[PDB]
Write an enzyme that holds these catalytic residues in place. Structure first.
Site, short mmCIF file in Angstrom:
data_model
loop_
_atom_site.label_atom_id
_atom_site.label_comp_id
_atom_site.label_asym_id
_atom_site.label_seq_id
_atom_site.Cartn_x
_atom_site.Cartn_y
_atom_site.Cartn_z
N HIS A 345 32.69 -16.02 -18.32
CA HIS A 345 31.99 -14.74 -18.17
C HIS A 345 32.85 -13.67 -18.80
CE1 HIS A 345 28.27 -14.89 -15.80
NE2 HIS A 345 28.79 -15.92 -15.15
N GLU A 404 18.24 -15.53 -17.68
CA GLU A 404 18.36 -16.30 -16.46
C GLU A 404 17.39 -15.75 -15.44
OE1 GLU A 404 22.15 -17.60 -15.06
OE2 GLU A 404 21.42 -17.92 -13.02
N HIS A 406 16.99 -17.43 -12.29
CA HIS A 406 17.31 -18.29 -11.15
C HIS A 406 16.57 -17.93 -9.86
CE1 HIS A 406 20.72 -21.11 -9.56
NE2 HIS A 406 19.53 -21.46 -9.12
N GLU A 449 19.50 -21.42 -16.02
CA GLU A 449 18.78 -21.50 -14.75
C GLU A 449 17.49 -20.68 -14.73
OE1 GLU A 449 22.52 -20.36 -12.87
OE2 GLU A 449 22.46 -22.22 -11.71
N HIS A 528 33.48 -27.56 -10.53
CA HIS A 528 33.44 -26.22 -9.97
C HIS A 528 34.78 -25.85 -9.35
CE1 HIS A 528 31.42 -22.89 -7.60
NE2 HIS A 528 30.77 -22.83 -8.75
N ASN A 585 24.64 -10.31 0.05
CA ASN A 585 25.63 -10.73 -0.92
C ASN A 585 26.01 -12.19 -0.74
OD1 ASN A 585 28.42 -11.03 0.57
ND2 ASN A 585 27.40 -9.23 1.46
N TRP A 987 28.65 -26.69 -2.84
CA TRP A 987 27.52 -26.45 -1.95
C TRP A 987 27.08 -27.74 -1.24
CZ3 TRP A 987 28.12 -24.57 -6.89
CH2 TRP A 987 27.63 -25.36 -7.94
#
Ligand SMILES: [Mg+2]
Ligand SMILES: [Mg+2]
Ligand code: NA
Ligand code: NA
Ligand code: NA
Ligand code: NA
EC number: 3.2.1.23
Lengths: 1011, 420
Positions: A345, A404, A406, A449, A528, A585, A987
């Site tokens: 990014h 994106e 998503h 995504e 990740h 958030n 996740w």
């Protein structure tokens, strides 16, 4: 009119997209890439004013500067100046999902600038303005008159300003909107900011001008001959005296040059492009571009009168390279690529999403220093300078459209809607128009995504029409849809299938071979790196190397998206989701980088570097085989440095010149090694050292390494006979052993070593006790929260079973007097609500030389969730400055992430034994440790350990690293067995079975002595 | 090379094959059983599911549910409330697909597929039963001797091993309990190797040249100590070959007043020696019992890389079923994952692998044909904490996979030896 709430309106009065221009009037300046008088920067001090909505902006601000306005630096994100909060949200849109509508309260930036234009610029030619990036939508006024409108946060918007400007002082007014219909297509997992965040500039071109140009390089079967094909568009008045010369330069030499009038080939019944010309240049034996060797030529594009007068010159860097898929493989110059990549990014902890040269270079040098060869622009076109730097330093770039969605339900609601094709096309087509000449860019991507919609197919085909020379990839809708030339999953595992409905994540190995499937597989996102992560990384790279069509992937991701805030004292700290009062958030999910926000390496970056090596080593006898994983370059800047060490003590070292052809091998015979009579374990270590410095590395840079166990000689010799004998004392509530000044206390109620003495100085602050828990890593927690539990997550499986509030019941604590020893025997059970979770059995045998041999045997219930650890913790009184250990090091290493670590004698300050992950957790563990030194204390065995000024309790109780206060003395966690960290994703449980503590019965032994 | 002997008697391997080739696969979540049919054409119209739950061998509840699964399909069987017993031990679920009617190729009640899961486990917290008896230590020049009631253990101070046991005036051992790191080579162990043309890559040869087989145990430590209610023998040996130390065994023997001999073994294996075929102990017993009764993986022969077929439960077999008659005699009859082994008066507890027969490893490795084998006096017992894989992918190069090699370097196990 609410153009920001209309996806059929993505611009007004905006000039066509095109590759980078400078409008040189001197061809020599064009060739050398020197600054152009025709390219002015408007960066600097501007006037800014924040409003709650565009309805709130006064009519006078168009003609006059607002008095309340502050002076601010442009480019900037107005959130970084604290006009409002930045929002970190992942999937869920920061606004109500109601396309094309945005909140009526839409934060509104009013930028303005008074600036000077030279008279000459208005006398002739065209003067346009360039906004390299405004987020997310803006209207432009010049001198009070309305100019235009624009969307797409990440591509430049240019406007012709000729009729608007006057000689002298002019005034721009830019009304920037935080939310627009464009927001729905900009839902990347990142901070949600706004402003004029990229460069602003003024460009003067002549009336008669170069409006576009395309450079294509095609080759023969063996790359001995190339043809460079330059296509040039003009705007303005077409007359027979107009010419275009394209010349090709190898540094200061002109290898080829072509000259032609306008009027292209016939292309249909109506004729040709009168305003276009194509030039072919033959180039014998062209120097080829790659990440290994970024050979670049220069193409200068000269628009001139036939009799020699230059109208203007544009130029680009040219890299002769061919990208193609053939027979299921991605080939660069006829050779199979292996992508050692990362997702990056555009993030700066202070400046937000504003990028600068220094940051960009730091990043590139760091990536190359750590054996990366490739980068994905997740998930938008980058600052134009990023591509220039990649061309020159050598990285493979995936250029990705700013799309994106998503947050939609389902994920392709917009992308399958033909009403969003106009909006989406602009974002794909204007990227390709801008970046198609950059050699570094090897693959186009349709976005991120956003499911799989028919707009993806339409747009996939458009690219393949306009630019056959690059493959197109897109992960949405299952990684292998019709909108991709590459299988590009995110977080597909190596061996374990993940059979989700509609969109499964097959094991990458298995994915290649599915019926009828032949495409190559390069993961768009894998491993990740959130907090203490990158466990199971070697697994991936074992696969990449074994399977031809598994051609690597892009790690997620490069740099933690953390921001700096200040406290009452004005001291900086690292901040994440929610720390700006932004809500809802997604907390610390914005920090998934191999490096901290200040580009300080995580330990995980060293495991990346090791696995991504371009040299493999095999050993047989005293012969080392070196294999080069380079496709193009010889190992010209390479020597091998080998050393032999017996338990840390060196015994023979030396270096050998490496001359290995690309994909070739070299054999290196070791000199007959001197075999030691001394007892222990011999270790060979080799290193590839680069003696010469380069653009990206310093002299003596180490690029590759590897270790082997050699001959091992076992200790037969018995310990020397100690004449002394420890005295045992038995009171009601204490067992007390004594030898010399050394003294141990065992509590008969608890069953633990409660205190220790050397002289009359205490050694312990809490007793030595068992530990079967750790401060939860981000991987252990996943998406689980206090208000919305994920019962699947490792932390929640632990909590529920009662590991963290396990109460240690005593079942036995006895003492025995041996011939030359005192033997305490303890046994414990840890229970939760009738259920016995673990059982500990221990002997502590203190002999005549002050040495205490602890033997531990734990039973673990088979139906209890496996433990994070099986070991002992205590709080040492000693606060020492140094930690010395024979083990794997020097950096933090774990069971599923220790391949990079080397075995040797290591010495480091205590602060290096703690890894300052922004969200505190278990950290700093070293594995494979035979010996540990800390002040007076020494422990021997075969163990894993972490030593810090922070308790596992505090690290589990604290949200941010700056809120950690050092406790008295030194907490010590010696582990016989420790669970994997995982991080295939964050996740779901990602620790692979072979790194789980599922054996049911565990045994380890320490010896604690004083030196 | 067959799954059956020339007479069509099954090799132990045929059961592993049968189990892996099953046409039904199962998943367990909570107490639901997910049954997936791997048939492509038929329904399960001659299939039934028998389930049973056992606590360390004792059946608690059984039940049989009808199977109606389409080809490629799934069925969800919700089990009834299983009884959670207070008692300490390991719960196991066992399911079977049973063909209730005869076919052209099978008898009624034919078993087609089976599978086991561990259910709940309850760990024993409650103490060992009280003992006020205390074993008495005798220390002669060249023997350590423990004595309790009629039970007499004798440790040779010169060799370092338990040299003899007595229950009354009865000899229990015909050879001393020593460590074993070798096995009688299998066909996967020998490969294409022959005594006239050596293949150095074959496992057997690697072991041979390293001196694994002719290793002399040279004692390092043999002390004895008396505790409040136990005698602790502590030994240490080193098997050497031509100056090179290959293995190091460190043991602790703890006899207490209940009659039981607790054994704790810790072995170091040199990284640069070929990984050992096994890490356990062997002895020639004196007794010749008729029945072997064990709690562990069974009933047929099973090894670490060949044991999915075998089920955990209580198995009782005649001694001769514990020997596998391969025409070419080798290591055989091993049973893995054992928590209890019963042979005559003897009983071993813990967690181990074992084989038991009238045939020494030395004889099995010296005998080329099974018919030349003579039954020896007493019963040879091999108890391994750990045993190498057997391989099979091919038989002309080493085929034992990394995870089934004994590469660790340090191994530990513990054994309780008692009488009942
Ligand atoms: Mg719009
Ligand atoms: Mg996303
Ligand atoms: Na590959
Ligand atoms: Na993230
Ligand atoms: Na924490
Ligand atoms: Na049926």
């Amino acid at each position: 009119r609410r153009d920001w709430e209309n996806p059929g309106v993505t611009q007004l009065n905006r000039l066509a997209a095109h590759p980078p221009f400078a409008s040189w009037r001197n061809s020599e300046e064009a060739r050398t890439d020197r600054p152009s008088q025709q390219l002015r920067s408007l960066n600097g001090e501007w006037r800014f004013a924040w409003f709650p909505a565009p309805e709130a902006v006064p009519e006078s601000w168009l003609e006059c500067d607002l008095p309340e306005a502050d002076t601010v630096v442009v480019p900037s994100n107005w959130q970084m100046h604290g006009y409002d909060a930045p929002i970190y949200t992942n999937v869920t849109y920061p606004i109500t999902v109601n396309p094309p509508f945005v909140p009526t309260e839409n934060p509104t930036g009013c930028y303005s600038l008074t600036f000077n234009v030279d008279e000459s610029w208005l006398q002739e030619g065209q003067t346009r303005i360039i906004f390299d990036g405004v987020n997310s939508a803006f209207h432009l006024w010049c001198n009070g008159r309305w100019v235009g409108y624009g969307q797409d946060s990440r591509l430049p918007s240019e406007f012709d300003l000729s009729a608007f400007l006057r000689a002298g002082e002019n005034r721009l007014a830019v009304m920037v909107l935080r939310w627009s219909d464009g927001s729905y297509l900009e839902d990347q997992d990142m901070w949600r900011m706004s402003g004029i965040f990229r460069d602003v500039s003024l460009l003067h071109k002549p009336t008669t001008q170069i409006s576009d140009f395309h450079v294509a390089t095609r080759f023969n079967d063996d790359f001995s001959r190339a043809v460079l094909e330059a296509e040039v568009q003009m705007c303005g008045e077409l007359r027979d005296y107009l010419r275009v010369t394209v010349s090709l330069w190898q540094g200061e030499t002109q290898v080829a040059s072509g000259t032609a009038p306008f009027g292209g080939e016939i292309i249909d019944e109506r004729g040709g492009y009168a305003d276009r010309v194509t030039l072919r240049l033959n180039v014998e034996n062209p120097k080829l571009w790659s990440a290994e060797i970024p050979n670049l030529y220069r193409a200068v594009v000269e628009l001139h009168t036939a009799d020699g007068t230059l109208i203007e010159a544009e130029a680009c860097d040219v890299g002769f390279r061919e990208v193609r898929i053939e027979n299921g493989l991605l080939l660069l110059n006829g050779k199979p690529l292996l992508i050692r990549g990362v997702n990056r990014h555009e993030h700066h902890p202070l400046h937000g999403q504003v990028m600068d040269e220094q940051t960009m270079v730091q990043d590139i040098l760091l990536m190359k220093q750590n054996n990366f060869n490739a980068v994905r622009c997740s998930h938008y076109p980058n600052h134009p300078l990023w591509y220039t730097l990649c061309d020159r330093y050598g990285l493979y770039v995936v250029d990705e459209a700013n799309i994106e969605t998503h947050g939609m339900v389902p994920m392709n609601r917009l992308t399958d809607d033909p009403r969003w094709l106009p909006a989406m096309s602009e974002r794909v087509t204007r990227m390709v128009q801008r970046d198609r000449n950059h050699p570094s860019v090897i693959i186009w991507s349709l976005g991120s995504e956003s499911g799989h919609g028919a707009n993806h197919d339409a747009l996939y085909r458009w690219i393949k029409s306009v630019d056959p020379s690059r493959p197109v990839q897109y992960e949405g809708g299952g990684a292998d849809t019709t909108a991709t030339d590459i299988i590009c999953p995110m977080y597909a595992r190596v061996d374990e299938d993940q059979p989700f409905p509609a969109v499964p994540k097959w094991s990458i190995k298995k994915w290649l071979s599915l019926p009828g499937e032949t495409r190559p597989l390069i993961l768009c996102e894998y491993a990740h790196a959130m907090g203490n992560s990158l466990g199971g990384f070697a697994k991936y790279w074992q696969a990449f190397r074994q399977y031809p069509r598994l051609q690597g992937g892009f790690v997620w991701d490069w740099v933690d998206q953390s921001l700096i805030k200040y406290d009452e004292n004005g001291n900086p700290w690292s901040a994440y989701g929610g720390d700006f009062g932004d809500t809802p958030n997604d907390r610390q999910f914005c920090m998934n980088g191999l490096v901290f926000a200040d580009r300080t390496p995580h330990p995980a970056l060293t495991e990346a570097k090791h696995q991504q090596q371009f040299f493999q080593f095999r050993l047989s006898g005293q012969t080392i085989e070196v294999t080069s994983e380079y496709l193009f370059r010889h190992s010209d800047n390479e020597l091998l440095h080998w050393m032999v060490a017996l338990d840390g003590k060196p015994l023979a070292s030396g270096e050998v010149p490496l001359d290995v052809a690309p994909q070739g091998k070299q054999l290196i015979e070791l000199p007959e090694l001197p075999q030691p009579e001394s007892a222990g374990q011999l270790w060979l270590t080799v290193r590839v050292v680069q003696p010469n410095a380069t653009a990206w590395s310093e002299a003596g840079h180490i690029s590759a390494w590897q270790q082997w166990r050699l001959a091992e000689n076992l200790s037969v010799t018995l310990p020397a006979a100690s004449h002394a004998i420890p005295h045992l004392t038995t009171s009601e509530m204490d067992f007390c052993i004594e030898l010399g000044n050394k003294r141990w206390q065992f509590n008969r109620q608890s069953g633990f070593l409660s205190q220790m003495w050397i002289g009359d100085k205490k050694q312990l602050l809490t007793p030595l006790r068992d530990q079967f828990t750790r401060a939860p890593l981000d991987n252990d927690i996943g998406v689980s929260e206090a208000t919305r539990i994920d019962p699947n997550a490792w932390v929640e499986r632990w909590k529920a079973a009662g590991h963290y509030q396990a109460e240690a019941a005593l079942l036995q604590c006895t003492a025995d007097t041996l011939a030359d020893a005192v033997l305490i025997t303890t046994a414990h059970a840890w229970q939760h609500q009738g259920k016995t979770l673990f059982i500990s059995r221990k002997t502590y045998r203190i002999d005549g030389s002050g040495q205490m041999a602890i033997t531990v045997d734990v039973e673990v219930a088979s139906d209890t969730p496996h433990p994070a650890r099986i070991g002992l913790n205590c709080q040492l009184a000693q606060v020492a400055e140094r930690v010395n250990w024979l083990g794997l090091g020097p950096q933090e290493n774990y069971p599923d992430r220790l391949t990079a670590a080397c075995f040797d004698r290591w010495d480091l300050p205590l602060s290096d034994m703690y890894t300052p992950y922004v969200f505190p957790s278990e950290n700093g563990l070293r594995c494979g440790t035979r010996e540990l030194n800390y002040g007076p204390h020494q422990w021997r065995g075969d163990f894993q350990f972490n030593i810090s000024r922070y308790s596992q309790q505090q690290l589990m109780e604290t949200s941010h690293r700056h809120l950690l206060h050092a406790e008295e003395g030194t907490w010590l966690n010696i582990d016989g067995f420790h669970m994997g960290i995982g991080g295939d994703d964050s996740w779901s449980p990602s620790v692979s079975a072979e790194f789980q503590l599922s054996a049911g019965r565990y045994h380890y032994q320490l010896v604690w002595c004083q030196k």
